[PDB]
């Protein structure tokens, strides 16, 4: 059978999701439990609020090689700068943040688009973090085959500073170093320490942000102006 009459979204995506371990992550694509029933709060317990992290000093640097195997459901993280990935280890689309969301598709090997539903030996997602001021995106997230969230973006921005739990800033760590922003230090969907870029599959990737409230924000990157929706809570 052919791919489609073009249909450049049903093809060009990695539809290889298996859950023999009944975690029920494809079931929660329709509904979502409360912040309590989903059992996030103990998951959220291990990362602390932005208030008491540390104080940044002097200039700014860059760092990579971080990344503790977990689910990135927190405002801080070090997404371990991205690279090419096969199409057999990805479930669902791959939204990469310009910050304006962009859906990346399967690119065969070097630069060849493919339309085999992402199931072939060579079908591969060629996503490479690079600051949009020099083209490309900041970073992006997707769910691996078995049903775990994964993320990867530009070299996770450190904030010049130290502590017992120094922050490997992935986004807009303001009031610590007044240079962090989603143009120099931003990696993933998290525009600000308390809300992500709103895209259709935001809740699925982060299933315990249900109590977040929509909001309209705008910012200029490179030579373009972006009108975007950010879903923030509390603030």
């Amino acid at each position, epitope marked *: 059978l052919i791919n489609t009459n073009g249909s*450049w*979204h049903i093809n*060009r995506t990695a539809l290889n999701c298996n859950d023999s371990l009944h975690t029920g992550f494809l079931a929660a694509l329709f509904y979502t439990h409360k912040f309590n029933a989903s059992g996030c709060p103990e998951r959220m317990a291990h990362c602390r609020p932005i208030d008491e992290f540390a104080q940044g000093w002097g200039p700014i640097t860059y760092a990579e090689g971080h990344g503790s195997d977990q689910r990135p459901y927190c405002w801080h993280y070090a997404p371990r700068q991205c690279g090419t990935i096969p199409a057999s280890q990805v479930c669902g689309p791959v939204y*990469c943040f*310009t910050p*304006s*969301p*962009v*859906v*990346v*598709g399967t690119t065969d090997r*070097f*630069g*060849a*688009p493919t339309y085999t539903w992402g199931e072939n030996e060579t079908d591969v997602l*060629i996503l490479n973090n690079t600051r*949009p001021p*020099q*083209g*490309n995106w900041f970073g992006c997230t997707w769910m691996n085959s078995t049903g775990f969230t994964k993320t990867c973006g530009g070299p996770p921005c450190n904030i010049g500073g130290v502590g017992n739990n120094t922050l490997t800033c992935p986004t807009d760590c303001f009031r610590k170093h007044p240079e962090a922003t989603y143009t120099k230090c931003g990696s993933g969907p998290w525009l600000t320490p308390r809300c992500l870029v*709103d*895209y*259709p599959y935001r809740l699925w990737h982060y299933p315990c942000t249900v109590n977040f409230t929509i909001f309209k924000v705008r910012m*200029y990157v*490179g*030579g*373009v*102006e*972006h*009108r*975007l*929706n950010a879903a923030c809570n509390i603030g």
Partner: antibody, heavy 120, light 108 residues
């Protein structure tokens, strides 16, 4: 087989405003990205801005300093572009181009172009 | 900005020859290039996609190749109706840009 259809030529005065429509005959604007491209006579193509319905996102090239505002009406299925403070150098042909929302797609459809004449 | 350069500015050739049009991006843009043809007083028409893919309905005499910071389009057998302006566009950054356009002619 979308056929974008634009409005007739407009003649305006300096300091006025214009609104050009683009209707997708035999098609739908949703599930696409819509951009506006202007061609000044004796010059190359230029990029005005873009609107993505599903993402609810709008990107406006900073060359046009806030004078461009795009909107879409699904009930009428039309794409409006509003330009205010029409200076003399705004005289040109304006096209509406349709693109896919996946990264790096080509403009596979264009409008016939609507001549805008700004002179006193 | 990813400034693009198209050469030659304007070239003339007889009927039945082969014509090469060179486009080059200021920085590497992988395989995101497209070639558009615009006749006088008409909307531009897409010719080449992915820097080497041929659109549906386009005559086979157009061929595209290249990568990185070097792209080329070629018409093997120039025809009477192939006289137009040709533009190269890069879709690698959110701020779309177009080439400077090249004018083709016919010799006699």
């Amino acid at each position: 087989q979308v056929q974008l259809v634009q409005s007739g030529a407009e003649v305006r005065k300096p300091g006025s405003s214009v609104k050009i429509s683009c209707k997708a005959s035999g098609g739908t604007f949703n599930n696409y990205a819509l951009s506006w491209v202007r061609q000044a006579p004796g010059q190359g193509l230029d990029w005005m801005g873009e609107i993505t319905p599903i993402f609810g996102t709008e990107k406006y090239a900073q060359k046009f300093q806030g004078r461009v505002t795009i909107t879409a009406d699904e009930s009428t299925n039309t794409l409006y572009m509003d330009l205010s403070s029409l200076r003399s150098e705004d005289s040109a042909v304006y096209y509406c181009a349709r693109r896919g929302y996946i990264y790096g797609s080509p403009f596979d459809y264009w409008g016939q172009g609507t001549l805008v004449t700004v002179s006193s | 900005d990813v400034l693009m350069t198209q050469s030659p500015s304007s070239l003339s050739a007889s009927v039945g020859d082969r014509v090469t049009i060179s486009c080059r991006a200021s920085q590497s843009i992988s395989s995101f290039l497209n070639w558009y043809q615009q006749k006088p007083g008409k909307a531009p028409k897409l010719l080449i996609s992915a820097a080497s893919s041929l659109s549906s309905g386009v005559p086979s005499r157009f061929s595209g190749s290249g990568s990185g910071t070097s792209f080329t389009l070629t018409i093997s057998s120039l025809q009477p109706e192939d006289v137009a302006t040709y533009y190269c566009q890069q879709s690698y950054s959110f701020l779309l840009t177009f080439g400077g356009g090249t004018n083709v002619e016919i010799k006699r």
